[PDB]
């Protein structure tokens, strides 16, 4: 807007708040807002320990006590009744173990996988945000939907340490702590093809467009528009997409 640049080719989203200031061409790339998260770092397997009991040291106390009373039953009418008594005592122990295992499994099955963005909007332990002074932050201000309004309210409530300056800091913020990002899905596709440790949770929130930034009121923008439409007709954009996004 100060005419210090006559063209902008870095990928900026086409929005209503910037159409009234500067001009854009046709979008050479389509876009969607999505959420980057780490993969769930759980599911401990039985390669060294497989967690057979619950309260394990006191389970070993139970095993030692039953082996001791089995030795006592071996060394000394009454034998049938005492063996039946310890038989249904072991049945009581088995019933308590079954009840505790069933409670643990029912608790483990009833969990939220935070797939949608509204599940991120509900909770506050999982901190979230976006790139500062970007199109995603500006879209969250003007969003009249109450879910994204709640997300922008939580972003503005703790604005000191949730708005990074670059997407490399986005990777450094996802890879530690419990942070999830809301940004452009092509960058998410690039960082998931480059690193197979992250997931894109949820679909595309809303569509946008990567255009060429031009100063307002130029026929240079129209010539750029016809050039981009002919180049996408020429198919070299698909070749550049297959060259750069792969690997």
């Amino acid at each position: 807007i100060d005419h210090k640049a006559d063209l902008a080719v870095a990928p900026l989203a086409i929005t209503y708040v910037r159409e009234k200031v500067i001009d854009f061409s046709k979008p050479f790339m389509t876009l969607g807002i999505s959420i980057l998260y780490r993969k769930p770092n759980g599911t401990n397997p039985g390669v060294f320990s497989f967690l057979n009991p619950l309260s394990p040291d006191i389970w070993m106390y139970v095993l030692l006590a039953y082996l001791g009373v089995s030795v006592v039953l071996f060394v000394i009418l009454s034998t049938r009744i005492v063996g039946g008594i310890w038989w249904f005592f072991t049945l009581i122990i088995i019933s308590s173990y079954t009840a505790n295992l069933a409670a643990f499994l029912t608790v483990e099955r009833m969990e939220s996988p935070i797939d949608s963005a509204d599940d991120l909007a509900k909770q506050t332990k999982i901190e979230y945000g976006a790139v500062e002074d970007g199109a995603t932050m500006t879209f969250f201000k003007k969003s009249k939907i109450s879910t994204y309004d709640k997300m922008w309210a939580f972003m503005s409530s703790r604005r000191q340490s949730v708005l990074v300056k670059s997407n490399e800091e986005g990777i450094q913020r996802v890879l530690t702590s419990d942070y999830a990002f809301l940004m452009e899905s092509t960058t998410i596709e690039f960082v998931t093809q480059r690193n197979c440790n992250l997931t894109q949770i949820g679909g595309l929130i809303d569509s946008k467009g990567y255009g060429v930034g031009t100063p307002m009121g130029s026929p240079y923008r129209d010539k750029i528009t016809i050039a981009i439409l002919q180049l996408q007709e020429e198919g070299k954009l698909h070749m550049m997409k297959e060259k750069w996004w792969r690997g």
Binding site: I58, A65, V69, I76, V82, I85, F89, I92, I93, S96
Partner: peptide, 23 residues
Amino acid sequence: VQNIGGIFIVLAAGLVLSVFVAV
């Protein structure tokens, strides 16, 4: 402990009753 403490208590009570019956 807790439930297992009562299990150990009733195990010791069954042992004392077995000792009393076995005489």
